[PDB]
Curated annotation (Swiss-Prot), chains A, B:
Superkingdom assignment: Bacteria
Record's protein name: Outer membrane protein P.68
Organism of origin: Bordetella bronchiseptica (strain ATCC BAA-588 / NCTC 13252 / RB50)
Gene coding for it: prn
Protein localization: Secreted; Cell surface
Covered range of the whole protein: 306 to 572 of 916
UniProtKB/Swiss-Prot annotation, chain D:
Compartment(s) of residence: Virion
Gene name of this polypeptide: mtd
The protein's assembly and partners: Homotrimer.
Domain notes: The C-terminus contains a variable sequence in which nucleotide subtitutions can be introduced at 23 sites by the DGR.
Protein name listed in UniProt: Tail fiber receptor-binding protein
Entry function: Tail fiber protein located at the distal ends of the fibers that binds to the adhesion receptors on the host surface, thereby determining the host range. The phage can alter its tropism by modifying this protein. Variants are expressed through a diversity-generating retroelement (DGR) that creates mutant copies of a template repeat and replaces the end of the tail fiber receptor-binding protein with these sequences, thus changing the host range. Milliards of variants of the fiber receptor-binding protein can be created with this system.
Domain of life: Viruses
Amino acid sequence: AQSIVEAPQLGAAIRAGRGARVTVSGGSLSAPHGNVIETGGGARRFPPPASPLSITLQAGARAQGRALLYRVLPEPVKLTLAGGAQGQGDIVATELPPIPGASSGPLDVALASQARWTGATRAVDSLSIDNATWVMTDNSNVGALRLASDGSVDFQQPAEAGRFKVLMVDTLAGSGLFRMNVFADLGLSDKLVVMRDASGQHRLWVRNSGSEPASANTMLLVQTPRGSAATFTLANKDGKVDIGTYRYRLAANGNGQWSLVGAKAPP
Amino acid sequence: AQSIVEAPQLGAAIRAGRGARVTVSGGSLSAPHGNVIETGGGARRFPPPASPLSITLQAGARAQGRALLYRVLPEPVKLTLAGGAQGQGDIVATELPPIPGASSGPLDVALASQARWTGATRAVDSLSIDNATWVMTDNSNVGALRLASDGSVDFQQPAEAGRFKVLMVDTLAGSGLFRMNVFADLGLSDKLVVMRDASGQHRLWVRNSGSEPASANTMLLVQTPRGSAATFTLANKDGKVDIGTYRYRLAANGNGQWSLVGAKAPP
Amino acid sequence: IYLLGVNHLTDGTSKYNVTIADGSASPKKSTKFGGDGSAAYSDGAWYNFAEVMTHHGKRLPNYNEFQALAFGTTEATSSGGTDVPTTGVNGTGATSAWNIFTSKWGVVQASGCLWTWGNEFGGVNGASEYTANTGGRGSVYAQPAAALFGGAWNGTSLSGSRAALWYSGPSFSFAFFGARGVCDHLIL
Amino acid sequence: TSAWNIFTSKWGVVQASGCLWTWGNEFGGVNGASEYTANTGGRGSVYAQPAAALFGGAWNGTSLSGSRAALWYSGPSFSFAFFGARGVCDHLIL
Ligand SMILES: [Mg+2]
Ligand SMILES: [Mg+2]
């Protein structure tokens, strides 16, 4: 509670395992070169779900490091950023399980009540953003993404002109916002792929990050399964975005593929 | 047969529609700024699958243009490159169908006996390479992919270093080879993503395209569903690739995710 | 005010809260044209909706009529969902409410709920050769498309007071195709 | 080059032809793109949109102008300094 923890290159600021319960309310945890949180390394296997080790950063907690969370990869984890907590890290895992085959518990993270994770991941099993924000800094994988009460994923604007990012998700559900970058006469954009199942009302805000276009060309923003039940709407003022002498609107057709059409702007 | 056909920017070398049957053997078709082949524009709608308009480029045919095939939407097409024919274009559809919520048939291409399409697509419903090669020139989308008898999908080597390409597929079947680009110093690589269903024995051949890595670092190569039935094997001889003073091998980890691991090369 | 009902024979063409006629729930066969009074047409072809409007001394809108009647609706928006089966109510899984699509003049579901067939021809022609597709009442040749206006529940950005599709032949039938009646204004 | 009254009709229609094209109320002729296009001043999109007829000819029209001069080219979205309009309506006998 309102404490400071500084870790050097080799280590981590917090290691929890064997079913621990950590809360960090307020204060700061830095780990410049290493991890902010590490999980496992001293195994104790159990058939029913014990206290699937949970870490909670709340009430204004600041956390910075190369990775925000580093999973060993025997144990299931449960990271939670709440109450305006802010962590810039990465969330990585071991990338080969110790026993090839038969399961491996979930790595679950909840972003809630005004919190803000800013990083990249291809390791999280299930993310739930709820009136909070994930600033996505690089291409990412997530199993099950859920949004609620104005939760957003905010594709971070590249300082590298022209370079787009892709967020792949296995299942989408609920209702949230997705701020996405678009590059006009290069005709490229941040994409969002849902692979098995999509549902709910979502919104897409569009940032003009590549300067205005020579022509009028469409841009794929969202790809979803064939007979999908999910809906998306352009969140910019009036359901349109003006890029130079052009105007764009979100239109989807056929098979949950939500492009962004545009043609000459009203004189 | 052995004919030559040139077309201006505003046009196409061939337009076929309403159950047309076109065969091009030998010869040449160019459309420097237009389409080589256009499909549709003159509606005739019948529920029985008559002679779904088909084009065949065979016996060493040459074909060049801004797109190899432009589909007018809401007629089904069957493009076939065989007998060592070579076409470079792009294959595009209209994005929006004329009637939002109705049946549209498929855009099916079949690369066979020694043929070679070089281009990119997000319009092809069902591509089947068989003892042929698709040189993929940019990010792409295909519904059902199917390979056989040394059918390959050669990811083209980028001129821009660091620029990786991604192929997304709904379903994968049969047995083929994938040439892929690797940028070891950056820890980045071409990716193949299968979203609904994968199966069969496939081979990956790695090309070094960003030499001298600081450390040994894993690079994701293939993504497949749940517990997919698909096997992949690294086709570089001895099942390894030596990038500077480092050796990489392919390992499948957890839920069908084939990464390229590697560490310091044996002395 | 409302899109054509299936029971137009007993309700009139324009009634609140009734099943909307489409390719599936096709309108009752006009009694003025050999309809028995409970039988429905076998599809939702232009011919059929045009027949029904005549029977009530009305016609399908022209472009200039449509762009006018539907002004005031929310432009470039659609009902969403998988269906709009009923007049004046929200659609099956509607992502926005019916009254968002209400004209300056109180035309209910003006746009983006169901395409209305029009009374203008042009756009994409059919086979340049005789085709007997007219419910067995003769043959067409180079038959141009019969206009469709407004957009339906599933063309999100495409829909609106000027939305227009000139592709469908008059013999086409789909569940996104209904009709809205118009007629002259007489002052005496 | 020729004075305005040259273009008065039998019915007293002034500048009846050969001055400005008039938009007509009839669709047909050259189609626009076979793909939805949002060129309606932001009131929806149009697929395969046929031209709105224009009648009469204009000052530049040379010997093509006249009572049956008709151009089926311009889509409803087009706009030029020689495209105008003339109103017509029904005749009411009570
Ligand atoms: Mg007319
Ligand atoms: Mg007409």
